[PDB]
Amino acid sequence: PLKYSYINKCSRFLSDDRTEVPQLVNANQYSPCVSIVPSTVWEDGDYYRKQLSPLEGGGWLVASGSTVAMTEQLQMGFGITVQYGTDTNSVCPKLEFA
Amino acid sequence: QVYNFKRLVFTNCNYNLTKLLSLFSVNDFTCSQISPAAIASNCYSSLIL
Amino acid sequence: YVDVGPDSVKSACIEVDIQQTFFDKTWPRPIDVSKADGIIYPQGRTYSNITITYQGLFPYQGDHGDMYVYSAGHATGTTPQKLFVANYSQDVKQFANGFVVRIGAAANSTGTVIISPSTSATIRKIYPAFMLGSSVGNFSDGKMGRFFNHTLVLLPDGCGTLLRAFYCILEPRSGNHCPAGNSYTSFATYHTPATDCSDGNYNRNASLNSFKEYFNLRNCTFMYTYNITEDEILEWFGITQTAQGVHLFSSRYVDLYGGNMFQFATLPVYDTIKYYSIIPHSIRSIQSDRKAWAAFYVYKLQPLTFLLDFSVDGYIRRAIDCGFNDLSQLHCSYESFDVESGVYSVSSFEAKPSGSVVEQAEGVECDFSPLLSGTPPQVYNFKRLVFTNCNYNLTKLLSLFSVNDFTCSQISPAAIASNCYSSLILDYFSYPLSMKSDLSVSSAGPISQFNYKQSFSNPTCLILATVPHNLTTITKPLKYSYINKCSRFLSDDRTEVPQLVNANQYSPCVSIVPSTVWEDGDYYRKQLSPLEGGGWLVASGSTVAMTEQLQMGFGITVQYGTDTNSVCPKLEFANDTKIASQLGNCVEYSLYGVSGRGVFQNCTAVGVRQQRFVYDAYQNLVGYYSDDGNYYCLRACVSVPVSVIYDKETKTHATLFGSVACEHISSTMSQYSRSTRSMLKRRDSTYGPLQTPVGCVLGLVNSSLFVEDCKLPLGQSLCALPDTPS
């Protein structure tokens, strides 16, 4: 990536301009703020906003982010989860039945 | 980017995770609610990466 | 991306006429839970003929569903005309943990054409089409239901034997009657039986082609197809979504007759669905050849629990929605479909919520009264009042003057009045309207340059106004005045450095200038001490004639606290219902941060007065002293016990509300104890409440009979006879 990037804020402004509602990310779901945030954050501390639709009651989507410098070898990570079941257990380690 | 994740849902297939481990140098490996050995050896309805 | 094949060539589409009033039919279809209607089979397990409790998503038993009817497009003579369709494209719904549907329920029967219903055509099964996704909004013509980014599409193709699923980005067409065009009405799709569905060659792309005429396929990430065979027998279908992705369920693949649903398929898409709609469709057949279609139904899933009556072959044959009625609760408590006869307690009515009552300290007050008397200072000499921790009404303050200039910086002028802040600061001065062009934080004029400036680190505002003829305590300067020069001569007596006024501060030159400027163009000089580096202060001013009413100006700035916003525009029930007390109701209350729900009633006072909260030994509030000086007593609220009487021999039941008495009893209740009480109403629609010595009851009847043993005694001398045996 040009820079490693992340969202360090995600909240929505109340339509009356006095309070703001935080939006912590839900387990196993993209944060709602991803719809306004760019594929990379162009500069550290950049922030973006989108007006909420009338179906949402108005107010503004708000998000901000930060970046980390690129490195000689790519750094990456993984998340792993599994799902238990009975007759749906079609995924297995490779097996030998000899 | 951390808010842009790719997901791979696996069903019906066979695996050998040590082949993947040979491809990278791991600087942090820790399991939760399961031993790291067992998660490699357990059969599942799905595997999600 | 997916090889979907080519986009349709013409940009043009058939017009879609909305004829929705023809579709106003009423054919409700409640779930027969005892037939196991709509039950999705449990995951990964099967069972013997033992009954089990279960938890999962299910339709509510009493839901009659949502009905939709597909219909033929208009046609005349031997050819097609513009489509006449239902307004179903506008029905955006919030997705809510899936749904299930019925297909073909009215099959092998007759009905009407609907759009031309006088023909009374027979009706046949037709498969539904749908669209799902994470966002919705207006079409460029303001039309309802456009979806954004990628969306799910489920579309039957050609005949019902082919079904396809898609995940793609739709793209609008600019042709006549199409989504980017401005002649667009509403989206629809169609099938044309004259060439589609040939008996030797079913048209596998028929539905797709009519779909493509309104939207170009773009960036399509998934496509699937499935094989179906015809059968007029009713089928069930539904959808759920999990962290493992979307899943499809149907009765067709496994249980054609029993209707049990199994997971037919799954999808790789795990993107959350926030919205749901049904896609409208129409038949393009010849007018004489039009065919009426069977009604289509939809029901919504909920996190309910049920008894399930498995057969020895593992098909669920019967079920009990535990929350549907009190009797169903009784069955669930014993895990059975035949509870032994008796009298049994069931859960109490909750009573009900009522509007809130709150008492808190009031009368913040905002030191603003200095603005209304004496002579206001000249604009370079402006007077400041700082406000923290206090209550205000800026619009009331500004109704004391006629405002001729209402502007603000970095805040709308309405918002600064209604917004709460950590502080509120107001500067005021006399100011002629002749100088109003020079009053802005951005102005090139001498007022912004030397007399008054405001910081750009905080929201700030500027107001010009004039005094009403009834504010006789306000007095005016002989002339309005301002400083039009402020600089310091450098100590070498040739170089000079201008001194623009500092934001939120008096200009340094104000120290040499007189409290008013006596004449236009007056100027003064002050020698500076060697500690200043020498030089001379230099300043001058200008004037405007006095006027019949004082002209005034104001500057306002605020600081918004991160969590310190203690100044707010609180009002003492202005424009409100005056809820400081009720006499009363179980309406939730707050008393100086103490809270609960309960009933209040004026009663004698107990000591110690002015300790506010009277409590019992268990710290339950007993009552409260109000700021009107009256004690009010609090008894919280009470609930109504409920019990039932069940006679399994006659399969009948009745109920008792106990001690509540029939003054609070009616055929339905607002409180409420169960999702419905209508099972009682099945017979109690015919009878008013009856008081008994134990309590008010429903369906009991006064026979005045004397019987030794009812097998259902109610205690006391009360008894409960069964109706006569079969």
Q: Are C450 and C417 in contact (CB under 8 A)?
A: no
Q: Using the beta-carbon criterion (under 8 Å), do A91 and B44 form an inter-chain contact? A: yes
C129-133 β-sheet, strand order: C93-94, C275-279, C129-133, C151-156, C162-172, C215-227
Q: Using the beta-carbon criterion (under 8 Å), do B5 and A85 form an inter-chain contact? A: no
At a CB cut-off of 8 Å and minimum separation 6, what does C713 contact? C719, C720
- In this structure, chain B runs to a length of 49
Query: Which DSSP letter does residue C198 get?
Result: B
Chains that touch B (3 or more CB pairs under 8 A): A, C
What residues of B are in the C interface, CB distance below 8 Å?
A: 7, 9, 11, 45-46, 48
At a CB cut-off of 8 Å and minimum separation 6, what does C619 contact? none
Kindly identify which residue of chain C lies nearest to residue B48, measuring between CA atoms.
Answer: C244
Q: Look up residue C291 and give its two tokens.
A: 């065919």
Residues of A in contact with B39 (CB under 8 A): 80, 82
Per the rule left: phi > 0, alpha: psi between -120 and 50, beta: everything else, C645 is beta
Spatial separation of the C-alpha atoms in residues C350 and C637, rounded to whole Å: 9
Q: Which site among C149, C244, C269 would you substitute to test the B interface, given the most B Cβ atoms closer than 10 Å to its Cβ?
A: C244
Q: Using the beta-carbon criterion (under 8 Å), do A7 and B12 form an inter-chain contact? A: no
| Torsion over CA: C130, C132, C136, C140 (sign) | negative
Q: Using the beta-carbon criterion (under 8 Å), do A93 and B41 form an inter-chain contact? A: yes
Q: Look up residue C515 and give its two tokens.
A: 């409290």
Kindly identify which residue of chain C lies nearest to residue A32, measuring between CA atoms.
Answer: C134
At a CB cut-off of 8 Å and minimum separation 6, what does C414 contact? none
Residue B20: in which H helix or E strand, if any?
A: helix B17-21
Residues of C in contact with A9 (CB under 8 A): none
Q: Would you list the DSSP string of C414-461?
A: HHHHHS-BSEEEEEEEE--GGGGGG-STT--SHIIIII----SSS-EE
Cβ atoms within 10 A of the Cβ of C698, count? Answer: 20
Name the 3-class secondary structure at A34.
Answer: helix
Name the 3-class secondary structure at A77.
Answer: coil
Q: Look up residue C415 and give its two tokens.
A: 């918002």
Spatial separation of the C-alpha atoms in residues C520 and C544, rounded to whole Å: 8
Query: Which DSSP letter does residue C413 get?
Result: H
Q: Which site among B3, B5, B7, B12 would you substitute to test the C interface, given the most C Cβ atoms closer than 10 Å to its Cβ?
A: B7
- In this structure, chain A runs to a length of 98
Query: What amino acid is encoded at C251 in this protein?
Result: S
Residues of A in contact with C272 (CB under 8 A): 29-30
Q: Would you list the DSSP string of C37-81?
A: TTPBPPTT----S-EEEEEEEEE-TT---EEE--EEPPEETTEE-
Write the residue in C244, C415, C420 that is nearest to A83 by C-beta.
C244
Spatial separation of the C-alpha atoms in residues C387 and C427, rounded to whole Å: 11
Query: Which DSSP letter does residue C550 get?
Result: -
Spatial separation of the C-alpha atoms in residues C450 and C169, rounded to whole Å: 60
- In this structure, chain C runs to a length of 726
Cβ atoms within 10 A of the Cβ of B21, count? Answer: 12
Q: Look up residue C315 and give its two tokens.
A: 């098909």
Q: Are C251 and C259 in contact (CB under 8 A)?
A: yes
Q: Which of C231, C294, C238, C239 is nearest to C257 (CA)?
A: C231
Q: Are C225 and C217 in contact (CB under 8 A)?
A: no
Residues of C in contact with A29 (CB under 8 A): 272
Instruction: Compute the C-alpha angle C568/C571/C574, nearest 5°.
Output: 150
Spatial separation of the C-alpha atoms in residues C322 and C171, rounded to whole Å: 46
Q: Which residues on neighbouring strands pair with residue C122, listed in sequence order?
A: C110
**Side-chain-facing half-sphere of C697: CA atoms under 13 Å:** 19
- Alpha-carbon distance A45 to nearest alpha carbon in chain C (angstroms): 19
| SS percent in chain C: helix, strand, coil, step 5 | 10, 35, 55
